[PDB]
Amino acid sequence: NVKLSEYEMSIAAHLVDPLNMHVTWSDIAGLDDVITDLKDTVILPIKKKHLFENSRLLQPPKGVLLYGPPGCGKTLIAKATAKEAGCRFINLQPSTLTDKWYGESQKLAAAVFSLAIKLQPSIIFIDEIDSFLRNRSSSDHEATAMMKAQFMSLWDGLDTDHSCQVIVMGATNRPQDLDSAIMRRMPTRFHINQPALKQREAILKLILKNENVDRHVDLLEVAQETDGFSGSDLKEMCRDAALLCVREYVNSTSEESHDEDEIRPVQQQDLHRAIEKMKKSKDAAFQNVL
Amino acid sequence: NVKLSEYEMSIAAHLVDPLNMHVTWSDIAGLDDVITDLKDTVILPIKKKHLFENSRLLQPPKGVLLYGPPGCGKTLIAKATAKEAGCRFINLQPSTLTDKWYGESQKLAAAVFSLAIKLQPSIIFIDEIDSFLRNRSSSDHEATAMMKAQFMSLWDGLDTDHSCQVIVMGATNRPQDLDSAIMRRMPTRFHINQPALKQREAILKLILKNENVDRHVDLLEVAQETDGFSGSDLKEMCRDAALLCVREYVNSTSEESHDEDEIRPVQQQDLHRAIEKMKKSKDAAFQNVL
Amino acid sequence: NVKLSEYEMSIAAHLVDPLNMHVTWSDIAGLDDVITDLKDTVILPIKKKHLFENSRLLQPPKGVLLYGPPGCGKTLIAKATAKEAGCRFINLQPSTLTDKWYGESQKLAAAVFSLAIKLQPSIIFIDEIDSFLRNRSSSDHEATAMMKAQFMSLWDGLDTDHSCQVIVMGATNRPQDLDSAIMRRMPTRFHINQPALKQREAILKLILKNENVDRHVDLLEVAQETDGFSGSDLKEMCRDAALLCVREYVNSTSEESHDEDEIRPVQQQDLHRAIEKMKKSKDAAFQNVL
Amino acid sequence: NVKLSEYEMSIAAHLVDPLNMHVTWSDIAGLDDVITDLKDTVILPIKKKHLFENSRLLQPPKGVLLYGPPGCGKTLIAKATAKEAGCRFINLQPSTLTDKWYGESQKLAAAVFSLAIKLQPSIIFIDEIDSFLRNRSSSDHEATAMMKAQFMSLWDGLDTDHSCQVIVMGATNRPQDLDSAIMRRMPTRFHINQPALKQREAILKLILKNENVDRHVDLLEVAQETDGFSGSDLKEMCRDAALLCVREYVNSTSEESHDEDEIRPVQQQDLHRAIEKMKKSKDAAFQNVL
Amino acid sequence: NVKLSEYEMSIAAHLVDPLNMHVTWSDIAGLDDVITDLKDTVILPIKKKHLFENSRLLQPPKGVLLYGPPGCGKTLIAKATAKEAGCRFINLQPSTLTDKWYGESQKLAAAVFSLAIKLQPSIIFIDEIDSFLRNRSSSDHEATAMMKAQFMSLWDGLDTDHSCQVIVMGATNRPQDLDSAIMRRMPTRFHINQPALKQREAILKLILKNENVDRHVDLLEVAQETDGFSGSDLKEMCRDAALLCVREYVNSTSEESHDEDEIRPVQQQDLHRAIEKMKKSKDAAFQNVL
Amino acid sequence: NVKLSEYEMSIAAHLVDPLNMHVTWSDIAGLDDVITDLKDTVILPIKKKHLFENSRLLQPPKGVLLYGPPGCGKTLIAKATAKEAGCRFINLQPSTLTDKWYGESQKLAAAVFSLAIKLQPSIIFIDEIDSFLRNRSSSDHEATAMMKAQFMSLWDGLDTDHSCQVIVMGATNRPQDLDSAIMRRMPTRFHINQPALKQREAILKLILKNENVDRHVDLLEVAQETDGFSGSDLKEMCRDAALLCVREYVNSTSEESHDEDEIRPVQQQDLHRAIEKMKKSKDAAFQNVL
């Protein structure tokens, strides 16, 4: 029902659909405290905004930054917040603004915020935000400065309107590189920390929850052996274990075994061997370093 | 037994026949690790799908991409997987979709996936996938955009149905050209690497396996001298050697030699000379470059 | 009077004739500033070259690229420049170089520039230049690389000769796809922009100039209502209006009306209804998108 | 009253007679929108040309191409336009130009257009236009090239004369085969589409209009059952039904029935059985395919 | 001794006789490298097939295509291979399959391959192969599709039988027109190139070999002056020279010259004048083009 | 004569040719002191290295960095040094290393320095060096770290070998962004400063040196009025002046002026007006800022 210019139709294409996203609060673990903080601060003003207006403050923050090591679940939480918020979420990947030839860039940068302002409430997200305004070339440097100026001016415009309903969000793996202008902005900042021992156990429980598992698995030992890994690496370790079991099954089946079609369930030794091989992969990477 | 529209009958024509294909796992070498990975990941869920459903994951990937230099055996492995999988394989060459005149295009793009969905399990393949959605003309640009949108929408539809049984596959020689939409899709990606020294020796063994060969041939030297070549070039080098032997035989026979009808077997010097001439052909190409 | 090889006779066939082309400077509107820039920079050195040689610079650019959305008049301006320049113009459509079988390709790529160099001054044009060197197949990839190398080498040859008199030109609808080699070449680049409100009014004046029009038509309202369209769509909108008037005339004539043979002139309501129906067609396209 | 050379008298023989043609606008159905477009664009300028000259444009198109699957009524509409236009219509079947021996060919190709130009207004038609310039032999290839060059040159001549009054038309079943030269020509192109459900019902109404029919026939069911057919096949299905009724009549009459000489009128069951047998014929063709 | 159906007797009529063919390897020049390749690849497996079976490969190719400009000797080499191979050669001119009325077509297409399979080894040839499956008419289109399907199915049947001994061959002047199905077939392809300077000298030597020639003729100059011609044109140029000498002889004899009955031998000036007149004929053709 | 791996052949393609570069010491002005420093320090050890080895020091620096505002001539001086040095110059644009998919990256980074080490003496250059090791993505971050480590390790390797003959060079517009690792490297650093009043006058003299100029031009006033510009802007200002003169010439010629074909020479008022218009362009940019 929104009225659009060619620019705003271009932005409308990047808008995500809440009916095709998958992840939810039920599909996240190991961050539940940060989950609680993010939910309470961001989602609550978004969903029922009029409730929180009787205050100069606790108005939804004009900037949210997620910072944490790679593989800690930053993109996962971005998607989960986008879906669970129930609002409109724009994924503003860098190519959207680094228009190398067209003066169309200025109106396009304007149109991003224009569509966001039309669609109230809505959330803007920038993955790899450190790279957002850095690309340079003979045709881009002056245009890069113009894009910088326009983006901060429109951000200040969002700040200026007391009736604004839109938030801007970002993620990054090496956040120190962020420009001082960003550092002065993005007031509220949430650390997506690596999972501790208990958090690692929670992560393993979430992953294994709908795997085929023998009840007598003990995970805390797996939690210790996995302490060197990140969340994505935890996922990939459960991967190596499952595929290892599948390999041994297929190799045993070929030797004239009966066609029962049933597999050995996940057992402690499986994850032990998988973790050893995962550490071997890390060791290959380290030898490449050494 | 399938019920078809004119579109689906048109697609049914492109469907390959598992009774006329030749190549098998017994006719591939130098990639056995990638062969193992492809087999385990793709074929196993395809053949006995119900076995792998007790998991949110290890479900057959929604996209498989093969990337490797020309002549490394990408088409060979595509055919080998198609036959060995035992499923239905559709070869979706570009002309199938670049309908330049008929609005029939939309229904045809729909019918490809329609037939694939009817035929469960089945695999879709696109050779030269980089060129799949690039052809342009005065009558094609808008239709090209429509085809793009429809193909990704139907791909998302395959993703949406948890009961989907169909995979889509692609190959390409210059894969960097691939559109970012493809890059975001095709999660699992297998590198068809060039044969290393040991892999090259394996390739030569496979080729010579049913040639007429003197046992005292030594190949590792041939492996080193062939290191500059690709697999197709290895094949063509064995070609030049065999034909060279045939030429010398016929020239010796004409000079009043007895009609014994027996040829000199493959010997080291034959492949040495053939490889030298092959490098001479490469040198002619290089001089054309220079 | 030129001496030709079979290749150069093949190229000579594609050469356009300045006596059968139609469009002129008198038949172009809405771009007059870009028209002025193109005329001054390109045509002036072409026609009276010796005038501009007393300078290391302002020599005709070694590459001209036209970039603008579809329907903005890129082909029209290409033809207009070709005719008005009075020089020889070669339309180098892609099929000229994508010779799929003959080694004739190399000599053919050479012959294009050979004929251009013989015919001084002359202009080379490549519509859909992005597709110029992209077509690929089992028989084409290596030949594609050879064609690439030859074309840039001959372009560098044109650059090398200070007495060169030939220009190369190109057009494209999605120019970002252009190879970085092209981006490094084609120094002077002209944007064929969409018509603004005043430019749109000029376009409508040009189209209606020799239509049958009632003087009391007001166009600025038509200019606003047409702002969503492109130039080709402006042309097609005047189309729908004229044909609508013809339809109502023929339907009124059949009902025993006198045989006066005179039609209702173009009036505001005609274009209003035609524009509404044109927007309805755009709406049908949008619903197909939605 | 025209003055003729032997060539032009030969062409004059192929000219059709508007007093012996049968079909009219009253004898066509299922295409009425395409009928309207063709009528408005082609016939109106033809009949009262001076009316449309006060425009650079909407002048009768220099080429009309009809493309549609076999049996969709392309020849029928060609004849209907020829008669209803009231102009002179030349049926230029391929043999007219593939003169295998006589240098008479050149003057004959000239004479076709010569007679057309003398006879203003007139329409040239080429059925199976894809085959028009393809026949080859030891005595024909060079002559084939000459014929190609002459035909496009004379077509360009028709384009050149602003006072030209003649149109050229063509039809084809596999139009993709058309040479790129044709594709660049023939600007206006009309799709003779297959009849949709409503169009199929209209076709059946047209066919049955002057058959002997019981009023309680219901056709929409026949329309659905006939959806697999083409227009010619619809005609042939009404054929099988009528002849089936005649067969049962004659077989019932021979058994000492009274000589009343009256037949069972067309009823639903008749067309049901006829359509079943028609689908059986299609099934025999399919089994031949299978 | 073969057992035949009416169809196979009809095909047996087209079979050529190795005792009435003329041309041989001793009567071909200017292609000796392509001659060597064709001989080695085709003839050797044909004549002594059991010699080459100890290999999955170097089995006679399932398709040979000859492509080259008109007059380069394609038919000559076809005949030479047919005779020198010593096998049975079938000349499958297009009329053999374009049966316009009889359902006999299907069995006839079957019978071609049936006789070929009975007669082992044998070679099938199709001149003007591009026209092989293109002829169309109201009575032919569906039959054309049936013929296409049958021919590729029987070709696949030849591919399927590892004991097959028959080859299929084709020639064409404009081979790009070939259907993609053919392009996917016919693996081995030999280019019948135009004669280069040395090849042209060889051609002239072959032609003059048994003419009456003065030893002091120099041909390399004739080779340069003839470079614009093709092989057939070289033959026809030697023609014009010989007939020119005969004309001058007869004109000198009539003027009361003695009845010695001896002619001036071929000398340089004769071929010089003949080549000038030949170029004059080419010039007349060019002026017709211009 | 160098022996190359596929990687080193890929690098060999980027190597520039000293026979096609244009600029020289004779084509640079306004930096002659920095020119002298660069020449003495870099070129002298490069050309006659054995002369400078009798010292632990004044060995060619292991890193040269050029830093200056955009348009000050950094690329010009890079090219001038590359040509005048007479050595081999590699232009290492960022895409060479940001290989997004292939493990080929590691060997490619090695091959850059490998070819440089083989080709002694040679100079490596990185334009936009700040962006050299910054690009990031899901597939690049770990590879980015690996590339960083490899590049500094190979740089340390160049430092380690006392017989090293290769230099590495870089340029950048916003050099503060440079990583601290770079800051610790690149010992010798040359500032490409903006032209002062005298330097600006020298720049104008260089540009006008082979323009058509009236001797009574006074430049110091032009030098003051141009003080706000950069070198590229100085060039573009001389541009606007020359083109302005050409425009007035062409407009005066059309009005029935005699065909003398002579233009008004460059005069003070021309540059005055051109500079005013240039400042107007700067003012438009400023208003966009404001």
Ligand SMILES: Nc1ncnc2c1ncn2[C@@H]1O[C@H](COP(=O)(O)OP(=O)(O)OP(O)(O)=S)[C@@H](O)[C@H]1O
């Ligand atoms: N706490 C968690 N709960 C569930 N999944 C997690 C968690 N942490 C990480 N993951 C997994 O990590 C994956 C991807 O890693 P992410 O950290 O979300 O991506 P990322 O943060 O963008 O890393 P990069 O380097 O920026 S691409 C998903 O497949 C998640 O399942």
Ligand SMILES: Nc1ncnc2c1ncn2[C@@H]1O[C@H](COP(=O)(O)OP(=O)(O)OP(O)(O)=S)[C@@H](O)[C@H]1O
């Ligand atoms: N590992 C291998 N084992 C057996 N044959 C191989 C192998 N690698 C390459 N080949 C041969 O390579 C051939 C064709 O090369 P492919 O790499 O399969 O085709 P391709 O990948 O499509 O190359 P292009 O450039 O895309 S056509 C076949 O004849 C194979 O026998």
Ligand SMILES: Nc1ncnc2c1ncn2[C@@H]1O[C@H](COP(=O)(O)OP(=O)(O)OP(O)(O)=S)[C@@H](O)[C@H]1O
């Ligand atoms: N400024 C203009 N003045 C006159 N005609 C114009 C103008 N802009 C567009 N047109 C019309 O646009 C037509 C064709 O559109 P073009 O833009 O020239 O073709 P194009 O740029 O090649 O578009 P594509 O997508 O590349 S085929 C012609 O019929 C012109 O009359």
Ligand SMILES: Nc1ncnc2c1ncn2[C@@H]1O[C@H](COP(=O)(O)OP(=O)(O)OP(O)(O)=S)[C@@H](O)[C@H]1O
């Ligand atoms: N819409 C229609 N109205 C009336 N008759 C139709 C219609 N469509 C097809 N026909 C019948 O179709 C017949 C012949 O088919 P056509 O399509 O006109 O011939 P065609 O297009 O040349 O087919 P081919 O394959 O080219 S011979 C005539 O007998 C018509 O009566």
Ligand SMILES: Nc1ncnc2c1ncn2[C@@H]1O[C@H](COP(=O)(O)OP(=O)(O)OP(O)(O)=S)[C@@H](O)[C@H]1O
């Ligand atoms: N290398 C050659 N050696 C001998 N005769 C040749 C040679 N090349 C061409 N000819 C002559 O060319 C003749 C006929 O030309 P061909 O090329 O064999 O026929 P073609 O290839 O079918 O041409 P078309 O256009 O297809 S009929 C014969 O009379 C040959 O003597």
Ligand SMILES: Nc1ncnc2c1ncn2[C@@H]1O[C@H](COP(=O)(O)OP(=O)(O)OP(O)(O)=S)[C@@H](O)[C@H]1O
């Ligand atoms: N001192 C100078 N002498 C001659 N030409 C100069 C001088 N300074 C700048 N230029 C001109 O400046 C041009 C390009 O500007 P450069 O400064 O060399 O490029 P640059 O340093 O890469 O700028 P960017 O922003 O990095 S693309 C060339 O056309 C030179 O002619």
